Amino acid sequence: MEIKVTEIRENKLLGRKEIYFDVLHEGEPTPSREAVKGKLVAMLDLDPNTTVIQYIRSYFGSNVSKGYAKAYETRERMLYIEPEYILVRDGLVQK
Amino acid sequence: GDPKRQRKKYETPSHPWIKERLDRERVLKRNYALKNKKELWRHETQLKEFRRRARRLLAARGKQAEIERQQLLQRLYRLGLLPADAVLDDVLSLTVEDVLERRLQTIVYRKGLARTMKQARQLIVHGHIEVNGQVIRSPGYLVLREEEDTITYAKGSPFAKEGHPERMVIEQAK
Amino acid sequence: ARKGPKRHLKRLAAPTSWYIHRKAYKWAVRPSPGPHSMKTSIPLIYIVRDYLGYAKTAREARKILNEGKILVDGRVRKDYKFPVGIMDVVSIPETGEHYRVLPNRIGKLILHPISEEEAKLKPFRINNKRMVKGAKVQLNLHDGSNHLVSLAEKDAYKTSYTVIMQVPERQIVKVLPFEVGAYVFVTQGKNVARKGKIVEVRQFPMGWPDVVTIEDENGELFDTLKEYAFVIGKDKPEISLP
RNA sequence: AUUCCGGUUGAUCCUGCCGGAGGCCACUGCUAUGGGGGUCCGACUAAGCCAUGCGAGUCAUGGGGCGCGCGCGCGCACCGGCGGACGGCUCAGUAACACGUCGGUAACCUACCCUCGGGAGGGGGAUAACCCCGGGAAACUGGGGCUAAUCCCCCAUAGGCCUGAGGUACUGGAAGGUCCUCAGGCCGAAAGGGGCAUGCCCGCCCGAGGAUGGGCCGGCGGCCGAUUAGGUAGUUGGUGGGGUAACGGCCCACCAAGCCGAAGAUCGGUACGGGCCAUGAGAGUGGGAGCCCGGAGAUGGACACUGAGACACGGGUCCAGGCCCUACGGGGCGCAGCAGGCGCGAAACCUCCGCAAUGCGGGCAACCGCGACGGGGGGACCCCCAGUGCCGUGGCAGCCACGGCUUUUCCGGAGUGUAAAAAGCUCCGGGAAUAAGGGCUGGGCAAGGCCGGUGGCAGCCGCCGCGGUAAUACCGGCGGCCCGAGUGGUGGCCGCUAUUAUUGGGCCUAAAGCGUCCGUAGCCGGGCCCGUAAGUCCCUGGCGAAAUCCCACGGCUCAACCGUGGGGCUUGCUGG
C-alpha cells in the first residue's frame, strides 16, 4: 500500500492539523488502521500518540481509498475535544 | 394537497398488439441483445424528450430560449449524437438506433473486445471492462464522446493477459 | 391549537437568505431575538461551522464560542443563537481574520474579507428620532441600537443619514447625509447589492413610501425604496465592498 | 400518435348508446434471486375500548441539613429558580375574515434576547428538610419543637397612571402620540446576591426603543340545491356610559326604524383550507391522508386557579356515560404519544438499540435528559440498476452431445465500515454451480383450421356470440403469441367522448322552437367631431415562503438521489 497526501489544514483554535490523503492498494484489500498510522507518522514526523484516524473509505471499483486524520499537539486537548468512540476505535484508550 | 411520488422514466405503447411495431421491436431486440421491451422504451423516451425540447425551443423569443438552445446542442455533442457544427433542425432527424449505438454493450462489441453482444454483456456484468479509470457494470451507461477512446480490459482481469485462451479466440476474428 | 410561542424551526421553513442544506436533516437552529430581523440575519453557529469550516459539529462550535474566541462588533459573543447581520464585522485574532457581512445579487449573506484597520468602523443608518426626558435626542438605528445626542445639535441628524462609529466604544465619526450626489449601496429588493449615486427622490400620499432613483457606475439608471438605500459616501465609498 | 375498432338490416347510408384498447389509486388470486434511493405501511368502517413498559427535565457558582471517605472531596432527599403553553397525534366539528393574497393598528400585550441611560438604602418574619409522637387497608395526612436563602412582607426614594391649564422642541403623509412648565391626586421597585481573586465572571430593579411571538380590522378570491322565497327584533344606526391589553351592540340606559334579498337572501346538504396531486396534445375534468404553512380537538358538555403566555394532550372542579382496587369506611382511570392488545371490518408492522449526528429545555461551563430524531427488524409501497450463463465443433429444426471460459449472484473467510452491530465496499478460496412464472390462443386483438374427451348437458361470454355426435370458441395434452420478477381479477378517477360542445355539438322528418303576441331586468346596438382616461397596451418599483416542476454543471460506479445557478409556478394584488 502507498500513501499520497492531498491536502493539509491548520486549525489554530482547536489546535490541530487536519490531513486529507489517498491510499493506493492495487490487488490488495483495504489496509488496516495500524499500518496507515505507522506510515503516516513515520513520514510526516507526527507523534504516534496525539494522532487519530477518522474514516478510511473504499469505493466501488477504485483500488484507491481516501482518508482523514487529525493530529493534535497536546494529549489533554485531544481527550477534551475528541469523543471517546474514535479513541477506542483507534486504540489509544480502553472501553 | 398531496406530495409527489417518483414516476417512471419510460412509456408504453398505446396498443399492445400491432404487427408493424411488434416486428420492428422484435428485430431491434434480437439485433442488440436487449433483455426485455422496457429498455427500448427507455431509449425511445430519451429521444422523444430531446425532440420535444427542440420543437418547443424552435423559433421562440428570449435570452433563456437561446440559452436552452445552446445547452441542448452542447449536451448532444457531448453525448456523441451530433457534431460541433449542428443546428436545431438536425435533432428531428435522430433515431433510436443512435442511442442504441451509444451504449457500452454495443461499443464493446464494435471495438472488437468481444465477439457477440451477449459475451459483451457478460464481460460488463462480471467486471472485466474499465472505462478510463473506473469499472462499470451497467450495459446501458451511454458512453460519452470523451471516453470512447479509453475503454479496455480491467487491470485485474484474466482477459488482460495477451495469452488468455478466450482472448485469443476473441482476437481470431479481427 | 398553539397556546404559546414557538421554540423550533424546520429546515424547509428557514429563510432564503441562508446557505443551508434543506433536505439533509429536519431541524434548524431557531435564532434568538436580537439586533437584526430574522430575514436579514443568520446565527453564529452556521458562520463557524458551515461557512468558514473551523468545526464539523455543534459541540465543537459551542466549545469554540464559549472559550471566548469570536468577536462581533468588537464584543465577545458566546451564544450560538446570536444573529449576525448586514454591515457586521466578524473578527478572529488567533488568525488575524476580519470579515464584513453583506448580501449577494441574489439576497444571500456572504463574508467579505477586510483589513484590521477598517475592521474598527461600522456604519449605522438612522431609522428614527425621538425626544427623551431631560430634553435629549435619541437616534434609533438600523441594527436596533440607540444613541444619545444633545438638543443643540439635533438638526445635524435626520432619519436616513449614516453615522460611522468606532464599534467597541461607540464614538461617532464622519456623518454622511442623504443628498442628490451621494453614494449608496442597496440592501433589499430586486436590485440588491447594487451601488450608485442618487439622482431624484419622489414622495407619495397616504402612507405609500418614498422612492429613489440611482445611477449605476456605468450609466444605467434604476429605482428602489429610500429605506433600502444605505449611504456609504459622498462621491467615493468609505468601506471595502465587493 | 392532436388515432380508432366491434355491435340495429335480406343488403346500404345516418343518428345514437354499450363495449374494447391507455394511465393512476385501493383490495385481492398465482408466483418470486440481488442491491441502492425515497416525503410509504389502522386515513376509508369504530373521534370505538384498553393490560403492561416507557414518551420532561435540569441547576451544588441559590440555601440549610444528613450520610460516606481523608476543613476538604463524593452521594441522597427537601426548600428555591427556570421549563413543562414547544415538540408529538388525529381530522370529529366548521360554508366562516376559517383559509389565501394585498394592506392597516395614530385602537393593543409580549418572560427568554440586543442597545443606550439610570439605580441596589433601612428593617423584620414565617416554614419545609431535621427531632419527639403518630392516624389510616389504601389513597393520603394531624400535633409539638428548630431553622436558612436569589422565599415572604414593611419604610424610603426613583418610577407608573388619571385629570386640568399653558409652551410648541420630535417623528410622520397626517398627532387623542412623544418633550418642556405648573397644579390636584391614586398605585408604588430592586437579590449589591453568588463565584474567583488582590478588580473580573454570572446575576437583580426602573425607563426609551427594537427584535420574536401573538391579538384585532379591512379590500379582493374561492362547492351543490327553488319539490328551499321572503328573512332579521340587540335586529340596523345614533347620544351617553361600562368593560377590555385594545376599536367595537362586546354589554347596558335612552332616541329612531332601519339591515339582507331573483345579480338568490334565509334554510338545508356535503366538507378541515392552501401550497400541491392524477389525467389529458391542449382547452379542461376530477382529488386534495402521508412533506410544509395555517385552523380545530384531546370520552361528551360546562367552569376556574397559577403563570409573560392556558381556560391546559401525560394539572384542577361539577354533570352524563363507561371501567378498576376495597379491610365496604373510601378511593382511582379514559393511547386521536411510541410499542402492543380487543372489537369493526375487504382493508394496514417489533410490547427492538442509542442520545454518536440535527435540534429543544436546563446549566457560567463541563454536561444531563428527550418513543422528537437517528439506527436496524417485518411488508409484492414507489423509483433506479442488474441476474437466472458465455464461446467453439457437429447435428436437427431454438434446442441436443463434446470441449473450454467466467463468477454479478450463491457458500465460507480477513479488513474497512458502524454509537455498537448489520448491510454495503476492497481482497482470498470453491464451483455452471444456486435462481421463471402469469395470462391468452373464433373476431375486435398478436398467436393451432393438430390429438383425445363431453355432447343445448356440463360449461364459456366486458361486447359480438360458441355448444343440439365430426366443437379451430367447453375440459385436458402437445405446440405457439404477450409481458416478464412480475403477471391476472373487482371497485374508483381521467381519457376514449365534438355523448356537456368558450375553443367545439344539435332542434322539417332521427331527442329537441313555448299556441300567438306586448313588454321589465339583463345581453347586443348606425355614422362624424371635441374632451376624459375607467376598461385596454408598454415601461418601470414593492409582493406572491420553502419543497414540488424544466434545463445545464458537479458528488455518491452511472442512475434514481443530493448540491450550485438560470427559468418557471403561485390563476393574482398594489405604487408611479
Curated annotation (Swiss-Prot), chain A:
Q: Kindly list any coiled-coil regions of this protein.
A: none
Mind telling me which Pfam families this protein's record contains? Ribosomal_S24e
Q: Which Gene3D superfamilies does the entry mention?
A: 3.30.70.330
Domain of life, per the record? Archaea
Q: Say yes or no: keyword Ribonucleoprotein present.
A: yes
The record's keywords, sorted A to Z, are:
Ribonucleoprotein, Ribosomal protein
Describe, as the record does, how this protein assembles with itself and its partners: Part of the 30S ribosomal subunit.
Q: Which HAMAP family match?
A: Ribosomal_eS24
This chain belongs to the protein called Small ribosomal subunit protein eS24
Mind giving the lineage of the organism this protein is from? Archaea, Methanobacteriati, Methanobacteriota, Thermococci, Thermococcales
Curated annotation (Swiss-Prot), chain B:
Query: In the UniProt record, which is one GO cellular component term?
Result: small ribosomal subunit
Check the record and name the SMART domains matching this protein. Answer: Ribosomal_S4 (SM01390), S4 (SM00363)
One GO biological process this protein is involved in is:
ribosomal small subunit biogenesis
Q: Tell me the superkingdom of the source.
A: Archaea
Assembly, per entry? Part of the 30S ribosomal subunit. Contacts protein S5. The interaction surface between S4 and S5 is involved in control of translational fidelity.
Its annotated function is as follows: One of the primary rRNA binding proteins, it binds directly to 16S rRNA where it nucleates assembly of the body of the 30S subunit.
Descriptive protein name: Small ribosomal subunit protein uS4
Q: What is the protein's species of origin? A: Thermococcus kodakarensis (strain ATCC BAA-918 / JCM 12380 / KOD1)
Annotated gene: rps4
UniProtKB/Swiss-Prot annotation, chain C:
Q: Which GO terms describe its molecular function?
A: RNA binding; rRNA binding; structural constituent of ribosome
Statement: the UniProt record of this protein carries the keyword Amino-acid biosynthesis:
no
SMART domains in alphabetical order: S4
User: Is RNA-binding one of the keywords?
Assistant: yes
User: What keywords appear on the UniProt entry?
Assistant: Ribonucleoprotein, Ribosomal protein, RNA-binding, rRNA-binding
A GO cellular component entry from the record: cytosolic small ribosomal subunit
Q: What biological process terms from GO does the record include?
A: translation
Domain S4 RNA-binding, by residue range, is: 42-104
Origin: domain of life: Archaea
Q: Sorted alphabetically, which HAMAP family does this protein's record hold?
A: Ribosomal_eS4
**What does the subunit section of this Swiss-Prot or TrEMBL entry state?**
Part of the 30S ribosomal subunit.
Q: Which family does it belong to?
A: Belongs to the eukaryotic ribosomal protein eS4 family.
What name is this protein filed under?
Small ribosomal subunit protein eS4
Q: Which organism is it from?
A: Thermococcus kodakarensis (strain ATCC BAA-918 / JCM 12380 / KOD1) (Pyrococcus kodakaraensis (strain KOD1))
Gene name of this polypeptide: rps4e
